Symmetry: C3
Subunit: 675 residues, 3 copies
């Protein structure tokens, strides 16, 4: 369990009584009890309230808060308050403030923007973390440390530049090695001294947010920035553990957030926690993929849903309300994919600057006789009823799809082949195909051991890191199926092209050679023409974005391009390799093809849908010992019916016994417990 | 009158003979008499020509211009020239130059961009105004002082920052009050010293033009900037009045210009003046609303139309010509809504940098045998014939629609609830409905005395200021009808939410509780379904953008939502309050709905259309003692006919008597004189 | 010949073995021989490899490269390496770095961005070019110097600003002349000292990249920046010629690149060279117009195609492949328009930062067995077979179309009359119309000797420079026909309006007075209505963007507007003027109209199509002594047939004799040799 002393799915979230008075806290306690809220994430944004100058600390206001919650037996997710520095610190110690992408030195304002290489910030953040831990080391109610808040954003100030040079000395050792890694013979970029190297932003190598002249420099700067923020986190973490070695530590992550390499971050964290904020507009399968990735960060360990909104989110272009039941629907989607808490931002609306129109459990009217409150209260009761049933349950997927931040960085900084190539979208296309057939799948790093899986899919694996090729050759040889696509295997970890023919280190295992890649103008497509009927694949399908022109070497040809000067050449190939098979998809296919492809690949390996359901009825499985829990989630606005099988199963949420045909209400959720 | 000395509608405008030679002034004079031009706005942009260093002043050039015009009995609207500082001043005294929103220190260029808190600028601006007024104090031709030119734009330099702190000390008195008003407990923003406070721009609290993290800081900085600039106006005004206590002083405004609180400005000005530049694209009823607002700034006092192009305006993306008759049509539209002058930019085209392709009376050919010149000459002659007839005439509207800049600021800085919420567009939806039925209406401030009205409409009155609620309650209880809408009554003057349920201070008078608001994605609409027929409203109409979900408390439900999860809940309510009524419109309705609503509200109060006319034939009224002047303006490219009433009346522009059926030419104008 | 020692169409391009090693260099030589590559452009980007500090120079690496190539008898286009400065130079001597349009001081990065007014850059760039020419002064293989690389971009630093003032003292002599040229009495812009003048960028007069308050300043600064970069070129050219006076010198230009006045550049260059990178999306007649313009830069002298990609270009939004044969098509298109070399970027792909997905002759596979390589080899073979046949061949066009950079700058900086006016687009509409009829045409400067032409077309000759009007009056009176359009003859060289009636100095020769100009909103059009059938022109056509409202004075009216208030007024006029004719086109007309107009004008002067061919089959002519080469180029993806005429002629490429009906394959090229 996330914490043995708190044996249920925690229910609560960000709570900020210091924005209010004592009387409102009385009301908070009363309404929290009504709603079933048993955890509070406190002290996220009160650095200034605690510390008014270099030497003065006041925790009495926090003591009162902890004590009051303790009387209710509400548990505490205690934040270190380092997510936003005090105005006096920004004024007296400007080294705390970032320099942005445009080269400007910032002034006090916003949040989440301390220079990760600031001596002042690291000095006081460490001291603050250590004082909190020390003061509260013996307190029974603290179940989790919430370090800082949403680490993110890049800094380009002098300290970062000086420290980037040091990071480079440690990474490359010599300028010779650095000059080679960066391919600096190009455009006369030869460096003769480390101080000659500067941060890549709008003043130097980069422009318009995502372009660069020197991708190796941009790539390493992102690695370095990610590491620098990670050092801040570890630094607070170690200071906390020194006083409370037994209290877990997390920090709140942001899913498919591009700027940080969370696989690397996750290793430093006791448990993953994240903040999920889908729009009305966000594909439901995408937010599943994100919860999935969050579980993948620690190779399938369950994570905390640290945040979500009980209703609207102010930051969205259109503050759409969550329709009746959707809040609950989406809470259970989170649990369905590994979440062992469901927590909100926030418990009571601010009044209150930029997030006053962010939804909360208790809102501006200040009472519980509210549609939003009712739904929250219903959920809370159900979470109480569930107790520890679902805790620690894990995924037993036999299909994995790989995702990597470094690969994403390189792809997004690349100049060509097409601005229409979107890495996450391509990964999502493959994942969506699995989600639609209820094939249980894991989002995994490229370093994950492949032996538990039967199908491994690596969409656009552009960057191939040391050991990767060997590991997939092994996987496939011993009977697995591996899938990869156009524009994969191009470069190594320094964004240097692996010479001798794409797909480089994967050429052997894929059995093909990709001669050249063609980018299609917007609105232009080609067509995948099957050689002959093959399982669920039959006739013609459309493809687009990029078209790899390839030569079957070892591999067999399953489909050919239908048009253009590479008409009749291979677009889908199958390589028999050892006891396994690898598939190379030379273009970006429509959803029908990926449906047939995924169906075939799963059948080939004897992996079966968890359940068959109408479109939009999502099924995911967590397993605890031998008991299988099937989360059935109906995203449709209408009631839906499906075959649940013949097994003796009971819906954990109704108590009723389910078998054969079963109906699920609109926005409905079932948790089928079997064996 | 604006000035007893000059008892007709002034005709002329911006005149810049100092760009030319003495010889062309002879031609200007000849053509001005031909055109009926009797007022010149001189010395707008010649600060540098006058003052070449800290100590030298040359007015001899201006003497000669003033004397030449006096020979023609042309009157003078004399500017102080402070609208653009000299290049030498920006060079020797950079404190005069602004720092922009991106945090950059500007160099010399442009105009209207002196730092309003600059010691140098204030020093020399005051001296210049003073020397100008002392020199010409006894001159018989000066009818108006024209301080500076279109004040506007924000500065973020150090002097403005330090004076922001002073302005805050004066506004709040203590840091305790400041921290509370700004809700600084949010994101650890507690200020312990005034110097910790910085200006909100891209370096600190704001981004991409209208976004902020701290709307309280951003709202106050806008107030501060507006006041700072206003102080510059007042400073020059006071110095002028020292020497010429009986010459009126104005400055030229920009209508619905967002950055300055013109209601505050107008209290400092003897008369309002403004610059009307409609695109081919602009709704005729919008520019009507704009003139109307300019009338409303001083509670119905007639205003000066200081500028408009006689033809094209270079600044428009497409320099569209005014079609034959349109210059005249638009001139009288200004007069119909309260202009006692019609003046142009400019009298002779420049040669000549960025405005050489801005229209003028006399243009690059240098002669009068010109379509544009003829139309100008024709107007001039009619204005001579009208004499003093219309001067000082006033609106007798029984219907008012409210507008407020501070309200607008808070709305435009709000994070949520919708980027498709546009305040001016909402105000204009209600105004347009009135305009279409020729219901005489006043744009008014939220402070205006309400007793004169029968119907008061306050669209999206998001911010409710001290005294506002009690004022509308008294108004309604005494027999008035009040209308407001979704997202009204939310905050106070500090953008702090009024707790306890929307619409807060207006909840008692509206008879409803607004529980939550839903933002519709673009292209999504809902339905207004009438519960029963009501006047001209029947059945179902569309609404969009935002849908408030409300509960009738004291109020009666007149229509319900037809779709979504709030289907069947109230969207239009009517609360009986004392002797009057208040209507709550919970969403943004289509034109058909608002047509019906407006007809009903007017009929309920016994207010009637001025006249019934075809679409695009606008009718507005000005009343002088016991005489009514109906301006009939046909915006259509085609002749139109209408029922002029049975009353005995003549058309001032033709002398003809009109009765019963009357036709008005394409682009034509009648001014009906009646009792 | 570009160089007598190398008597064929050169074939090769950018080559960068210093990114590689000796072994790969052996493969390069082997493959270059297979492909018939005989020229290498080396040392473009190796400043830092050569010079590691202020005092140290290493050329030994370059000696070896040059020797190795000399062994294969491959010729050298030797670059000075000044297009990208060393990181140490940027670090130690920041005066080398630019300040951008946003006022920001750049840091080390990118290329082509040394401050052209930098004492450090000029010092070391001169030395480097000197040492190279001295070291290789007796080397037989060097056939061309390649100074720097793609000069471009503007700088706004202190040194440029100060030097701007010096450049203005040279241009205008006195502040009095400056203030008049710039019209500074507008907006109190009077300058009393040169140091009061600042560079125009976002800090001063300009915004949004192309907008300005003071066009005179913006216009002059662009002249100045262009002049400053030209000075850099000349500085290196002179040092080179000091040591190798008989080796020709060029730098590589960018066609219709907006920022430099290439006409002025070309006078300083021994031969023009340029870099042709069309997208899949670029009109074929446009890239023809660009090659054409490059020929015109030196009044018909053949030029170098210095670059083009052999396949894809990474910089395009969509890296689309050149379809089979297209690389060859576009190479002969260059030759057809005056190119006496065909050279690539680059010979072997980098590995390697931002250009690794730029196409090359030898690519990442590293061998010749590739579609791209074979197409290169094939062309290489033909070029060998052509030998000296086409060299020095010239255009004998009877039709000219004028283009001018200063006119372009003034038009693009102008405030109004329409953001839908695009100078180059208009120039191209006229060029296209000729292109489609295979009428041989030269792009020319406004200063070209007009005597050799029969038809001279000047689309939107907004700026009229001294001597121009006289020159066209003389051309027309001697019997030529001249064509110009709406918005021509408006200003002089300082962007000051020529008063007294548009088109000012062109009013007599055009025989019309343009009274005013109307900008159409997007999607609005008007109608060109012919008075009577006239040659290929008949009935109605559409026109748009801008409509000049004009009066026929001496000119005959051939067509009138069909709609709007100017309906029935002239839109096409013909003025007889001496033995010649002038045509004024008062709007931007559709393609069918321009087809007819062009056909008429050409018949009138007895000028005839080279050949009649199907749509998309381009024909162009070069003439050498008594021999005419017709370049026939089929851009269609389908085989096409055409009457080749009855003459005795052979296809240079097949050796076959062609007469009467001939077919040409998809993407095909024929070069008909006739008399
Ligand atoms: O297409 C890329 C190409 O762009 C220009 O032509 C440059 O001169 C070359 O060095 C190369 O950068
Ligand atoms: Zn930093
Ligand atoms: Zn200021
Ligand atoms: Zn410079």
């Amino acid at each position: 369990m996330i914490n043995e002393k708190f044996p249920k799915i925690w229910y609560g979230g960000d709570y900020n009584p210091e924005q209010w008075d004592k009387a409102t806290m009385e009301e908070d306690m009363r309404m929290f009890n009504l709603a079933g809220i048993d955890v509070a994430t406190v002290n996220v944004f009160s650095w200034a309230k605690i510390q008014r100058d270099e030497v003065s600390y006041d925790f009495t206001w926090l003591d009162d808060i902890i004590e009051r919650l303790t009387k209710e037996n509400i548990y505490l997710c205690l934040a270190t308050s380092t997510g936003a520095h005090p105005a006096w610190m920004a004024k007296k110690y400007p080294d705390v403030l970032r320099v942005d992408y445009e080269g400007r030195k910032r002034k006090f304002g916003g949040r989440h923007n301390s220079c990760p290489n600031s001596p002042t910030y690291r000095k006081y953040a460490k001291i603050l973390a250590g004082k909190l831990a020390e003061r509260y080391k013996d307190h029974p109610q603290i179940v989790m440390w919430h370090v800082s808040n949403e680490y993110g954003g890049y800094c380009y100030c002098d300290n970062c530049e000086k420290q980037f040079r040091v990071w480079l000395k440690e990474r490359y050792g010599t300028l010779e090695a650095l000059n080679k890694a960066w391919n600096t013979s190009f455009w006369s970029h030869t460096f003769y001294d480390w101080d000659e190297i500067v941060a890549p932003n709008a003043l130097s190598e980069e422009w318009s947010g995502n372009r660069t002249n020197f991708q190796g420099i941009s790539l390493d700067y992102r690695r370095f920035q990610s590491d620098s923020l990670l050092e801040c986190f570890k630094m607070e973490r170690d200071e906390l553990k020194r006083w409370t070695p037994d209290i877990p530590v997390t920090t709140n992550l942001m899913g498919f957030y591009p700027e940080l390499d969370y696989f690397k971050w996750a290793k430093e964290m006791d448990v993953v926690s994240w903040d999920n904020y889908p729009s009305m507009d966000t594909p439901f399968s995408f937010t599943a993929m994100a919860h999935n990735l969050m579980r993948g960060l620690k190779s399938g360990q369950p994570f905390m849903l640290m945040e979500q909104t009980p209703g609207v989110q102010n930051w969205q272009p259109y503050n759409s309300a969550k329709r009746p039941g959707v809040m609950r629907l989406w809470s259970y989607q989170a649990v369905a994919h590994g979440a062992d808490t469901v927590m909100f931002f926030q418990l009571r609306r601010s009044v209150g600057a930029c997030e006053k129109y962010h939804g909360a459990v208790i809102e501006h009217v200040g009472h519980e006789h509210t549609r939003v409150f009712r739904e929250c209260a219903e959920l809370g009761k159900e979470l109480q009823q569930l107790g520890d049933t679902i805790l620690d349950a894990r995924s037993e997927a036999k299909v994995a799809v790989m995702y990597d931040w470094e690969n994403r960085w390189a792809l997004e900084l690349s100049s060509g082949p097409s601005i229409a190539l979107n890495y996450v979208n391509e990964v999502h296309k493959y994942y969506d195909a699995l989600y639609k057939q209820n094939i249980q799948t894991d989002m995994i790093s490229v370093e994950e051991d492949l032996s538990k899986y039967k199908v491994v899919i690596a969409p656009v694996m552009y960057m191939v890191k040391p050991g990767f090729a060997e590991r997939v050759e092994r996987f496939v040889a011993q009977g697995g199926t591996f899938v990869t696509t156009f524009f994969s295997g191009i470069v190594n970890e320094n964004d240097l092209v692996t010479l001798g023919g794409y797909p480089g280190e994967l050429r052997n295992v894929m059995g093909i050679w990709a001669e050249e890649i063609d980018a299609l103008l917007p609105g232009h497509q080609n067509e995948i023409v099957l050689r002959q009927d093959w399982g669920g694949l039959r006739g013609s399908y459309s493809c687009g974005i990029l078209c790899d022109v390839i030569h079957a070497e070892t591999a067999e040809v399953l489909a050919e391009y239908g048009a253009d000067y590479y008409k009749g050449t291979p677009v889908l190939t199958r390589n028999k390799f050892g006891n396994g098979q690898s598939y190379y998809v030379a273009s970006s296919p429509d959803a029908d093809f990926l449906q047939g492809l995924i169906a075939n690949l799963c059948e080939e390996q004897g992996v079966k849908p968890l359940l068959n359901t109408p479109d939009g009825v999502e099924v995911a499985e967590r397993v605890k010992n031998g008991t299988s829990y099937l989360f059935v989630m109906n995203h449709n606005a209408e009631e839906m019916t499906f075959d649940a099988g013949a097994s003796r199963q009971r819906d954990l949420l109704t108590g009723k016994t389910i078998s054969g045909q079963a109906t699920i209400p609109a926005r409905g959720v079932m948790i089928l417990e079997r064996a």
